[PDB]
Design an enzyme around this catalytic site. Structure first.
Site, PDB file in Angstrom:
ATOM      1  NE  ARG A  67      10.134  -1.357 -23.513  1.00 23.65           N
ATOM      2  CZ  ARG A  67       9.086  -1.812 -24.200  1.00 23.65           C
ATOM      3  NH1 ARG A  67       8.597  -1.111 -25.241  1.00 23.65           N
ATOM      4  NH2 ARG A  67       8.508  -2.962 -23.858  1.00 23.65           N
ATOM      5  CE  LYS A  80      -9.514  -7.848  -5.646  1.00 24.05           C
ATOM      6  NZ  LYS A  80     -10.396  -6.875  -4.966  1.00 24.05           N
ATOM      7  CB  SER A  85       9.673  -5.016 -26.854  1.00 27.58           C
ATOM      8  OG  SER A  85       9.529  -5.748 -28.077  1.00 27.58           O
ATOM      9  CE  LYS A 139      -3.972   1.703   2.759  1.00 31.07           C
ATOM     10  NZ  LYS A 139      -3.940   2.906   1.872  1.00 31.07           N
ATOM     11  CB  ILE A 190     -12.348 -10.369 -31.105  1.00 32.01           C
ATOM     12  CG1 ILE A 190     -12.600 -11.160 -32.391  1.00 32.01           C
ATOM     13  CG2 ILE A 190     -13.471 -10.476 -30.089  1.00 32.01           C
ATOM     14  CD1 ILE A 190     -13.063 -12.554 -32.172  1.00 32.01           C
ATOM     15  N   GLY A 197       6.852  -9.270 -28.982  1.00 31.74           N
ATOM     16  CA  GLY A 197       5.544  -9.710 -29.427  1.00 31.74           C
ATOM     17  C   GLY A 197       5.306  -9.437 -30.908  1.00 31.74           C
TER      18      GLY A 197
HETATM   19  C1  LIG Z   1      -0.575  -1.001 -26.854  1.00 26.86           C
HETATM   20  C2  LIG Z   1       0.023   0.415 -26.800  1.00 26.86           C
HETATM   21  C3  LIG Z   1       1.244   0.768 -27.325  1.00 26.86           C
HETATM   22  N1  LIG Z   1       1.716   2.029 -27.244  1.00 26.86           N
HETATM   23  C4  LIG Z   1       3.015   2.418 -27.815  1.00 26.86           C
HETATM   24  C5  LIG Z   1       4.181   2.071 -26.913  1.00 26.86           C
HETATM   25  C6  LIG Z   1       4.552   0.652 -27.304  1.00 26.86           C
HETATM   26  O1  LIG Z   1       5.864   0.238 -26.852  1.00 26.86           O
HETATM   27  C7  LIG Z   1       4.338   0.809 -28.823  1.00 26.86           C
HETATM   28  C8  LIG Z   1       4.126  -0.460 -29.645  1.00 26.86           C
HETATM   29  O2  LIG Z   1       3.118  -1.277 -29.076  1.00 26.86           O
HETATM   30  P1  LIG Z   1       3.294  -2.895 -28.854  1.00 26.86           P
HETATM   31  O3  LIG Z   1       3.913  -3.511 -30.053  1.00 26.86           O
HETATM   32  O4  LIG Z   1       1.931  -3.353 -28.284  1.00 26.86           O
HETATM   33  O5  LIG Z   1       4.256  -3.004 -27.553  1.00 26.86           O
HETATM   34  P2  LIG Z   1       5.805  -3.403 -27.268  1.00 26.86           P
HETATM   35  O6  LIG Z   1       6.676  -3.376 -28.494  1.00 26.86           O
HETATM   36  O7  LIG Z   1       6.242  -2.427 -26.185  1.00 26.86           O
HETATM   37  O8  LIG Z   1       5.653  -4.863 -26.638  1.00 26.86           O
HETATM   38  P3  LIG Z   1       5.731  -6.356 -27.345  1.00 26.86           P
HETATM   39  O9  LIG Z   1       7.145  -6.908 -27.077  1.00 26.86           O
HETATM   40  O10 LIG Z   1       4.675  -7.121 -26.515  1.00 26.86           O
HETATM   41  O11 LIG Z   1       5.316  -6.227 -28.851  1.00 26.86           O
HETATM   42  O12 LIG Z   1       3.188   1.652 -28.960  1.00 26.86           O
HETATM   43  C9  LIG Z   1       0.962   3.025 -26.628  1.00 26.86           C
HETATM   44  O13 LIG Z   1       1.456   4.184 -26.553  1.00 26.86           O
HETATM   45  N2  LIG Z   1      -0.228   2.724 -26.076  1.00 26.86           N
HETATM   46  C10 LIG Z   1      -0.726   1.502 -26.139  1.00 26.86           C
HETATM   47  O14 LIG Z   1      -1.806   1.213 -25.623  1.00 26.86           O
HETATM   48 CA   LIG Z   2      -8.178  -9.020 -29.712  1.00 35.89          CA
HETATM   49 CA   LIG Z   3       6.018  -4.569 -30.472  1.00 32.82          CA
HETATM   50 NA    NA Z   4      -0.350   3.772  -2.370  1.00 31.58          NA
END
Ligand SMILES: Cc1cn([C@H]2C[C@H](O)[C@@H](COP(=O)(O)OP(=O)(O)OP(=O)(O)O)O2)c(=O)[nH]c1=O
Ligand SMILES: [Ca+2]
Ligand SMILES: [Ca+2]
Ligand code: NA
Ligand SMILES: [Ca+2]
Ligand code: NA
Length: 328
Positions: free
Chosen positions: A176, A65, A173, A53, A99, A182
């Site tokens: 990063r 929880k 990602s 918290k 979906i 993904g």
């Molecule tokens: C889903 C999403 C992504 N983004 C931006 C930041 C994310 O890093 C970027 C690309 O989205 P993603 O490809 O969903 O995310 P990712 O590359 O960080 O993760 P993964 O390894 O699971 O593919 O778009 C938003 O700003 N808002 C959002 O809701």
């Molecule tokens: Ca979906």
């Molecule tokens: Ca991605």
């Molecule tokens: Na808090």
DNA sequence: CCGACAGGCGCATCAG
DNA sequence: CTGATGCGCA
DNA sequence: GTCGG
């Protein structure tokens, strides 16, 4: 994925997926993910709800929880949710790209509750859904960095064949530094498309078309003037299994706004939510194009000058975080 | 104790 | 047709 | 569900 408070963050993630997919409460989803994320970066083994918290984003109810989860190894509220036929059917259908919560509820009501059901009601699905179903297994597979490196090479080399003036930068990602991704995210600039003029049309289309020609892009989910969303696949060699099909996003961003664009697209999504909410607390609004001041009466002023990623952090008085310290 | 919670692209569909 | 909205998505 | 004014 065995981790320090993994029990707790898994439980909160599940609860966030419920609130998004079943309850349709976007702010509960966000608040659960914010709490999960804050707990994931906390470097002690949490021993009580009261201790958790103390962290920002964790309040009375997550605390309670955590007390239960720690004492008993599970959560009743989630025990109930998992047995509820309807709840898990809606959660499942949402895993199909295209979906969301609304459409998943409307299928479950009409008796469409499984993959076999989806696969015999093709006619009930729009184009995106249909492709999401076609590649259902494939899109739930992760992409090792080494494959991301090959996909990068193809994308950058073909972009260069169209026009040496393009700059394509692989974000999400990947940027990063994650060892698996993904999906692929490419930010595209060209000198002709700036915030003050579009000196050439078809700038995104031409790139999409070239990547279709060499068979890299295989389907299109959506396509507009600045944003493409679809499917790609690495070429494979004689006798090998094919590579799974992969989700790809391409965003053309005006060249002068490159740094806001790449901040946005580097993410993570949660980090962007945090960073933008902090900006609001400070009197600014950040999008993929600009950072702007906020006027007394809700009115966003003129874009501030930005010539680095770090500039955007300075404005809201944040120590610079390297892409790799923006995950989780 | 109550408003505000990140920001915006593309597609689908509705009233006029 | 245009413009408004909700959905699913990054 | 959480939090700052
Ligand atoms: C889903 C999403 C992504 N983004 C931006 C930041 C994310 O890093 C970027 C690309 O989205 P993603 O490809 O969903 O995310 P990712 O590359 O960080 O993760 P993964 O390894 O699971 O593919 O778009 C938003 O700003 N808002 C959002 O809701
Ligand atoms: Ca979906
Ligand atoms: Ca991605
Ligand atoms: Na808090
Ligand atoms: Ca993506
Ligand atoms: Na094939």
């Amino acid at each position: 994925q065995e981790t320090l408070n993994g029990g707790i963050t898994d439980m909160l993630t599940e609860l966030a997926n419920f609130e998004k997919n079943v309850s349709q409460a976007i702010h509960k989803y966000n608040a659960y993910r914010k709490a999960a994320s804050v707990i994931a970066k906390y470097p002690h083994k949490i021993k009580s709800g009261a201790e958790a918290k103390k962290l920002p984003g964790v309040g009375t109810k997550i605390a309670e929880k955590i007390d239960e989860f720690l004492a008993t190894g599970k959560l009743r509220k989630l025990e109930k949710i998992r047995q509820d036929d309807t709840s898990s059917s809606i959660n499942f259908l949402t895993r199909v790209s295209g979906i969301g919560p609304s459409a998943a509820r409307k299928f479950v009501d009409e008796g469409i509750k499984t993959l076999e059901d989806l696969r015999k009601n093709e006619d009930k699905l729009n184009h995106h859904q249909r492709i999401g179903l076609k590649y259902f297994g494939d899109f739930e597979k992760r992409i090792p960095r080494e494959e991301m490196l090959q996909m990068q090479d193809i994308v950058l080399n073909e972009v260069k064949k169209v026009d040496s003036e393009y700059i394509a930068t692989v974000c999400g990602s990947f940027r990063r530094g994650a060892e698996s991704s993904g999906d692929m995210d490419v930010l595209l600039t060209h000198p002709s498309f700036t915030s003050e003029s579009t000196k050439q049309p078809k700038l995104l289309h031409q790139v999409v078309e070239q990547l279709q020609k060499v068979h890299f892009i295989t389907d299109t989910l959506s396509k507009g003037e600045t944003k493409f969303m679809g499917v790609c696949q690495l070429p494979s060699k004689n006798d090998e299994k094919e590579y799974p099909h992969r989700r790809i996003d391409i965003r053309l961003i005006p060249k002068d706004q490159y740094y806001c664009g790449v901040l946005y697209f580097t993410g993570s999504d949660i980090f962007n939510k945090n960073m933008r909410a902090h900006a609001l607390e400070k009197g600014f609004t950040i999008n993929e194009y600009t950072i702007r001041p906020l006027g007394v009466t809700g009115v966003a002023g003129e874009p501030l000058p930005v010539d680095s990623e770090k500039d955007i952090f300075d404005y809201i008085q944040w120590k610079y975080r390297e892409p790799k310290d923006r995950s989780e």
